[PDB]
Amino acid sequence: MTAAEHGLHPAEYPWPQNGMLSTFDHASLRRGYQVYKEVCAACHSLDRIAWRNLVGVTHTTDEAKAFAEELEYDDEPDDEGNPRKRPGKLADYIPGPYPNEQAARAANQGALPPDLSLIAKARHGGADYIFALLTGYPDEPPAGVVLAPGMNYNPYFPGGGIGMARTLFDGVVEYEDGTPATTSQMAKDVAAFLTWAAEPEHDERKKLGLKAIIVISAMLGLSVYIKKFKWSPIKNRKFIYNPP
Amino acid sequence: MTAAEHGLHPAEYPWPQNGMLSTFDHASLRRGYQVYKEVCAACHSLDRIAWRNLVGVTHTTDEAKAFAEELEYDDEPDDEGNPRKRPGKLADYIPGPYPNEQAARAANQGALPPDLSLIAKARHGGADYIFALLTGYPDEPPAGVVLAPGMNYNPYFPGGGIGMARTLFDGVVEYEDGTPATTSQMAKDVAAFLTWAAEPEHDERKKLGLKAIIVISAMLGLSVYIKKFKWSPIKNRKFIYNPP
Amino acid sequence: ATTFYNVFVKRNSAFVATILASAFVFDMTFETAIDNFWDRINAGKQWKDIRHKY
Amino acid sequence: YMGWWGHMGSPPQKGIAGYTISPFAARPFAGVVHAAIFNTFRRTKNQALFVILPVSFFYYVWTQASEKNEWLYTKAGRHELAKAL
Amino acid sequence: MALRKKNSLLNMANSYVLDSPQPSNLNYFWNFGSLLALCLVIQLATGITLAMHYTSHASLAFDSVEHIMRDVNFGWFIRYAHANTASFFFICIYAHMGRNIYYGSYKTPRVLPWSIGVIIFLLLIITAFMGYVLVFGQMSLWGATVICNLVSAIPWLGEDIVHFLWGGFSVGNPTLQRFFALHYLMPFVLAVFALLHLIALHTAGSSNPLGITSNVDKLSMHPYYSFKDLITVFAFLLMFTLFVFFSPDKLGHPDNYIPANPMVTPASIVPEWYLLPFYAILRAIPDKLGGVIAMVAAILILLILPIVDRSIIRGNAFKPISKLLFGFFICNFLLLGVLGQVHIEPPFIVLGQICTIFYFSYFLILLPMVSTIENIFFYIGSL
Amino acid sequence: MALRKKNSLLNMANSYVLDSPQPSNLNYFWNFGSLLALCLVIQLATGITLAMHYTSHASLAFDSVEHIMRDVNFGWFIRYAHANTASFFFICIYAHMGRNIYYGSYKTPRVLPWSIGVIIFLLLIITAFMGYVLVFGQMSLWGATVICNLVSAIPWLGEDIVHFLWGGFSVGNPTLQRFFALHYLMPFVLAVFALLHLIALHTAGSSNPLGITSNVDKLSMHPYYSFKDLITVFAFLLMFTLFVFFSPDKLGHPDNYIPANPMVTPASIVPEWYLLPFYAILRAIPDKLGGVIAMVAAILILLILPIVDRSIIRGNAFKPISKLLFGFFICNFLLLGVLGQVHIEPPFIVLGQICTIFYFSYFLILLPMVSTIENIFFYIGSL
Ligand code: HEC
Ligand code: HEC
Numbered sequence A, B: 001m002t003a004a005e006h007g008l009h010p011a012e013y014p015w016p017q018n019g020m021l022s023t024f025d026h027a028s029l030r031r032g033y034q035v036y037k038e039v040c041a042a043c044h045s046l047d048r049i050a051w052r053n054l055v056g057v058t059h060t061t062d063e064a065k066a067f068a069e070e071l072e073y074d075d076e077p078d079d080e081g082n083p084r085k086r087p088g089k090l091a092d093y094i095p096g097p098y099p100n101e102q103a104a105r106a107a108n109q110g111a112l113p114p115d116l117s118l119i120a121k122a123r124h125g126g127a128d129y130i131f132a133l134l135t136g137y138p139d140e141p142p143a144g145v146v147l148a149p150g151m152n153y154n155p156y157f158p159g160g161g162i163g164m165a166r167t168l169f170d171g172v173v174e175y176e177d178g179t180p181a182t183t184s185q186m187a188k189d190v191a192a193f194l195t196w197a198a199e200p201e202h203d204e205r206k207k208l209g210l211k212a213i214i215v216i217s218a219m220l221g222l223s224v225y226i227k228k229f230k231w232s233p234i235k236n237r238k239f240i241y242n243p244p
Numbered sequence C: 001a002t003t004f005y006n007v008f009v010k011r012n013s014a015f016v017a018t019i020l021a022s023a024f025v026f027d028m029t030f031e032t033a034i035d036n037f038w039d040r041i042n043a044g045k046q047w048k049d050i051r052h053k054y
Numbered sequence D: 001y002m003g004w005w006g007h008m009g010s011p012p013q014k015g016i017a018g019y020t021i022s023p024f025a026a027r028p029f030a031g032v033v034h035a036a037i038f039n040t041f042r043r044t045k046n047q048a049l050f051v052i053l054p055v056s057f058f059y060y061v062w063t064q065a066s067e068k069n070e071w072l073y074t075k076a077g078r079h080e081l082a083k084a085l
Numbered sequence E, F: 001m002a003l004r005k006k007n008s009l010l011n012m013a014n015s016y017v018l019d020s021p022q023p024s025n026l027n028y029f030w031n032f033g034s035l036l037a038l039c040l041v042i043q044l045a046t047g048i049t050l051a052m053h054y055t056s057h058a059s060l061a062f063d064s065v066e067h068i069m070r071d072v073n074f075g076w077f078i079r080y081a082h083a084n085t086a087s088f089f090f091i092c093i094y095a096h097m098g099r100n101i102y103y104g105s106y107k108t109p110r111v112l113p114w115s116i117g118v119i120i121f122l123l124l125i126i127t128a129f130m131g132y133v134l135v136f137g138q139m140s141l142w143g144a145t146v147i148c149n150l151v152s153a154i155p156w157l158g159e160d161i162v163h164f165l166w167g168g169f170s171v172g173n174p175t176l177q178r179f180f181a182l183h184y185l186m187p188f189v190l191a192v193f194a195l196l197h198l199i200a201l202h203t204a205g206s207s208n209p210l211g212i213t214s215n216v217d218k219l220s221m222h223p224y225y226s227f228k229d230l231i232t233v234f235a236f237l238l239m240f241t242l243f244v245f246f247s248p249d250k251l252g253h254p255d256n257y258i259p260a261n262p263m264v265t266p267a268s269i270v271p272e273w274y275l276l277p278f279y280a281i282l283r284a285i286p287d288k289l290g291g292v293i294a295m296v297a298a299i300l301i302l303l304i305l306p307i308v309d310r311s312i313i314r315g316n317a318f319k320p321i322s323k324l325l326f327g328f329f330i331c332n333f334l335l336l337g338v339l340g341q342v343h344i345e346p347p348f349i350v351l352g353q354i355c356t357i358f359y360f361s362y363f364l365i366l367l368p369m370v371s372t373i374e375n376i377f378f379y380i381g382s383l
């Protein structure tokens, strides 16, 4: 295939979580949630994440309950069987911007903005792809590219023509921790956040792996000693043959 | 327990479908659908039956499509993602009178009229129980029975106090086949219809059973001949013993 | 050192008891040791490190 | 074709005397350094060709094919691609 | 040498189903073993088929069973076949255990096949209990609730174990999905144990109704017992046919056609008919934990038959007193079954306790006494 | 006599895992058998566990896998363990088949274990294909679509058979539920065949790397191969750990994290990596039916190795030319694997065909020729 049809492959950036012993930077995760909430959530859902998932990752229990309680969710019908709404609870999932696919496509000139809960696992490149894509809109498409109407040129997207316009510009977010909200900073944070969303076990998984590696390594070393020990009678065996 | 707490056990009526070789009377089934539609459907759903299930049992394809097309069902959203209705198709299930349990209970002084798709299997007695219950409202409760408010006395119902009032009265239905719509006739028809609804395979099942009984009987007879044939050398064996 | 063999190793019942008691101790101490190690190499990154702001 | 202990199906053995020592009496890692270096080098040297020849050939084949394929789908390779289809 | 003997794989088959030397006088009660194998095969075939149409999620489970009944071609047959064969499996297993007890199949040298058999019986109970839950009707749910609450009796950890079984704080979706997985698995485990008890038996060979050695007079398994097994296969299939085609719900509880409702409690929560005797034994003991122990002990006590039967003679064919005692034991086991489904009311409360005492005293008192006395009567009686 | 020999059940275990006489010179490539058994055990344990949390209905399946990843305690581990072990299962099975081909384990007297092994290999492929579909991501759906459409090639009945497999007119809910049931079952069938091939092997005993008889010098399976098997178990677990804990998605296709969408077709539909060589063989033949036959023949042709190997010597340890030919065969099989995942473009089209011709010509031409020639060289060479 042409390189265009594949998309340019994203650079390997040194994410804090790259590295066998490295967790996510939770401060970056928190910043990234704020980017999701103020920019991406206009078009993209995060349906597999519940408010409770943020607790003790990015937010305290209280902050997350506050986020839940601001929204209205469908309750069980009342006693006359009429529909009712209730305020959100931590068990509720973060609600999407559109009620269905058709509404989503209508608002985006036919393109359907994917749910972002898994997008870091669902594209080759992961965090790097999300970072490259958000930051990789050139001012002008390379001369000779014909964009379909409502498409934007982005070399990292396969085919080049992406239905999502550039959305991160310096200072679209005001971070609550005083970090300068540059395009690059926001893309890094949101890409980290989405990576966490796709694999929330990441931190625990790598710690258990460290324990496993250590125990299994020691057992492997000992199994070699024990094998050699038990086999030495066979390896050391000597013969004397006297033809009869 | 007291007999009251159990409910009076319904008589064994001679249903056309009782009998190893007997089908439902389909004319009765059709009449019974008309009773369901004009009396019971006000309160009771039949959610497991689709329009297509009536075809070639009680109604032709055309009659059933006519029934489906009179109703509105939820379609897929339109292109602006707004909800839409469509006319019914044969694949659609017969729709219920109430949107949820709460609405059902509110309309029935707290009692929830059960779905009737399985009610013939779900009560001891089956057709006989449904027939006995519909026809078994006495004019006056036996002296000394205290009914809870909104309950009606019916001895066949366990405890005696049933939230469903008497509903079949002579001529509430006008049958399309000219059969006199007496309380007993309507109860018999609707009870037959509900029995069909619970076990729609009934007719086919009994015919295949007849074939199975015949084949398996013949195989059993032959297996006895063959066993005796093959065993005769062992059964017929004779010994002569001469102590050595 | 004969003494050590005689007490902990000679009887298999004693040897298996020793192994399981050692596994208990190892399991508890290794858990604690890795926890501390993990927190040092991932310093300022984890929720416990930023939680104090809230 | 194989028996069991005591009647394994060996031709009769006579006159082979077999000697060995207890695992507790031996050094399990005796001469490990010599083996790990010299013995492994000997065994690897003797098998090297049988691995290197097929690997190098099929890697070269793949390299040539992947490079041609890449080149055909450039601007420069437009004409050669048109002929190849 | 013939191929069926030469080739190791064929020879294993040969040793079990063809050249296997059997006593020449096995009566029809030796046919339950093959019927149980037939039930196991029917259950695997129908079960795996239902699994292709059933959905384990609690929101869909009951409806998936209705879908099988109504929409799937011959779904009604496969469902009823599976449900009814579960009943026949227990009729045949009780018959098989009855045969074994009457004819002293549990005595040396057959203690091991007997003891593995007791485990097969426990696995069958677990399998059938979990399968019943999968329908997720009212009896499914309430039966799971009350049976799993028995584990709450285990001291100290009981409550924690129940929450662990349920995967939750009540019977619900997690419980249903795990029972699906285990119900699928358990029949394969059961098949392995069934095979083990046969392999164990193959060292002694089958017992026979006289209780003497058959080493003197053997018959190949095929063709003689092959063709004799066909008769009961066709008799079984006739009984199967009458239930599955003509009365598919005679052995069923109507309440299982009402979807599970954790709020409404059904009138009477009873297990499936084949577990009823154990349920009666449980009710007999007033203490919760006592009841559970008694119920388990009612099965595990079968393991002591090899010890408590003191007879020098194998089986009951020639023992008039043992035959009478056995008759009473069997009828009492049936009475326990009946008392398992009555209401906890006078006078059945006291009666249930008396039957439970009779059940245990058979193993612990009467069989050891009667078998000792008959030994003496045979010796003095033949002098 | 010792209990492990006296008791029939223990003696069967004893004969396989303890007193089993093994050649005293098995090298590390004889350890794949036990690794495959370990994979099979891991897959059973993790698989049955996933089944407790997975929902087979197409409306819920993908979400149930997300629920396992996100909500179930250690669900992430059990899911990744199951998914990665499926890859390791194929690495080990190819290694095991490679060992068998190199050392002539397929020659008399071991044709039967070899031939049963070829069936095990087919069942593993079917098991792993169905398991992949259960996720119901994009690759799940599109892979099922394309692979099940191959059956459309069967003349006359093909279309009807595909609709029969699907239970429908496209891959959807009925297909998913049936694959769940069968994917659960197939590993037990696979375990039975694995056991059969061992029983078949036990008549000849294991081959050894010299290809001579080991009847002269045997070693008990335990403790020597028990402790030697531990080394590869721990080496395997280290490799397992690095994948499952540190790179759980290295062997995966990202597209399987997008829910199945019958509208959107993924860029490239390729099977899981371990099926790729067969996929390359299929693409090589232009005819639809031809392609399918070739793909099946690529597996079934292994059954003719016992015939086409004309050597008087078992295995390749002493056959320089056969070793070179084997090296080229293995590397070609890997090239086929690579060409299975490239796009159908020049120059890979022609290359794929040449590799496919080389694949078949190994069995049909080169091995018979080379083995005949080496026979002559050994005889003339040693005169
Ligand atoms: C107002 C619209 C809009 C906003 C704001 C928006 N997106 Fe999107 N996004 C889209 C649409 C539409 C697509 C689908 C593009 C297509 O398929 O052509 C999309 C696609 C994506 C994709 C996947 C592209 C692919 O490979 O399929 C990612 C990742 C993404 N968006 C992330 C984000 C992040 C991160 C933000 C903001 C921080 C963001 N989006 C803001 C509309 C938006
Ligand atoms: C306007 C209300 C209403 C009408 C009309 C009605 N029902 Fe009912 N029905 C109920 C209610 C309420 C219950 C629940 C009674 C209770 O649980 O106390 C019920 C219960 C039943 C039951 C089951 C009783 C049980 O055992 O749980 C059957 C069967 C039944 N109805 C059938 C019918 C049939 C057949 C008709 C008419 C041909 C009918 N119903 C008409 C309200 C109605």
Ligand code: HEM
Residues within 6 Å of the ligand: E029, E030, E031, E032, E033, E034, E036, E037, E040, E093, E096, E097, E100, E105, E106, E110, E113, E114, E116, E117, E118, E120, E121, E190, E194, E197, E198, E201, E205, E206, E207, E208
């Ligand atoms: C799936 C359930 C079972 C199957 C398929 C099965 C099958 C068989 C078969 C085929 C035989 C040999 C023929 C026969 O005597 O009928 C047999 C014998 C036996 N079974 Fe079972 N069985 C099962 C369950 C049980 C149970 C639950 C027990 C005991 C509690 C048991 C104990 C025995 C004994 C003791 C024998 C030897 C009897 C004898 O021949 O004297 N089995 N079984």
Ligand code: HEM
Residues within 6 Å of the ligand: E040, E043, E044, E046, E047, E048, E049, E050, E051, E054, E065, E079, E082, E083, E086, E089, E124, E127, E128, E129, E131, E132, E133, E134, E135, E183, E184, E187, E188, E190
């Ligand atoms: C000993 C073997 C088995 C026994 C005794 C058994 C028993 C049962 C029972 C009693 C039920 C309740 C039936 C009902 O009332 O509807 C049931 C349901 C079920 N069983 Fe089994 N079963 C067995 C084997 C299997 C196997 C191997 C499967 C394979 C998956 C299976 C799958 C099912 C399914 C899916 C249901 C639920 C659908 C239904 O209720 O019909 N069963 N089983």
Ligand code: HEM
Residues within 6 Å of the ligand: F029, F030, F031, F032, F033, F034, F036, F037, F040, F093, F096, F097, F100, F105, F106, F110, F113, F114, F116, F117, F118, F120, F121, F190, F194, F197, F198, F201, F205, F206, F207, F208
């Ligand atoms: C689940 C898959 C399998 C398992 C668990 C398994 C297991 C084993 C085990 C334990 C042995 C004995 C020890 C060894 O040589 O490694 C063995 C030997 C053998 N297996 Fe497998 N095997 C499997 C699949 C296969 C397949 C796919 C084949 C052939 C295509 C095969 C053919 C053989 C042969 C021919 C032997 C005898 C080799 C010899 O010792 O010389 N097996 N297998």
Ligand code: HEM
Residues within 6 Å of the ligand: F040, F043, F044, F046, F047, F048, F049, F050, F051, F054, F065, F079, F082, F083, F086, F089, F124, F127, F128, F129, F131, F132, F133, F134, F135, F183, F184, F187, F188, F190
């Ligand atoms: C030889 C044994 C087995 C192999 C090779 C195998 C292979 C696979 C594969 C490749 C998948 C796709 C995994 C993914 O990417 O997520 C899978 C999924 C699955 N397998 Fe298996 N499997 C085996 C045994 C079993 C068994 C015994 C069960 C018991 C039910 C089972 C249950 C499942 C379930 C529920 C899934 C779907 C959940 C998931 O994707 O993780 N597997 N299997």
